[PDB]
């Protein structure tokens, strides 16, 4: 049933700016935390981004913070990654995750519990 499904990858220009989207299905965004991921090349995947689904509080962690902002929308069950004066460096596979916020324990790639299937970024140079 849970299931995430995240659209938006493309090519950018450094500078430039993209949002990505996940939808979920399976579950609504109320009883959740919905956490963004990132795997550049080579290197080990990591937080991004996480959202309260009831209460939208979000924590970022000190490289992106700034230029990275997530939000929700219940209404269409979807969180939203927009991403801000990209550079070459932020290419990577962004990857949407989710767990339940009875067992919320941090924004940390072994704190989720389900997983989308990722969507490329790509900062041209």
């Known amino acids: 049933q849970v299931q995430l499904q995240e659209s938006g990858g493309g090519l950018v220009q450094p500078g430039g700016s993209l949002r990505l989207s996940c939808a979920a299905s399976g579950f609504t965004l109320d009883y959740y935390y919905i956490g963004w991921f990132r795997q550049a090349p080579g290197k080990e995947r990591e937080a991004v981004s996480c959202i309260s689904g009831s209460s939208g509080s979000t924590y970022y962690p000190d490289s992106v913070k700034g230029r990275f902002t997530i939000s929700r929308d219940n209404a269409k069950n979807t969180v939203y990654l927009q991403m801000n004066s990209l550079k070459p460096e932020d290419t990577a596979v962004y990857y949407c995750?989710?767990?339940?916020?009875?067992?919320?324990?941090?924004?940390?790639?072994?704190?989720?519990?389900?997983w989308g299937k990722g969507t490329q970024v790509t900062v041209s140079s």
């Open positions: 995750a989710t767990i339940r916020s009875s067992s919320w324990g941090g924004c940390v790639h072994y704190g989720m519990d389900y």
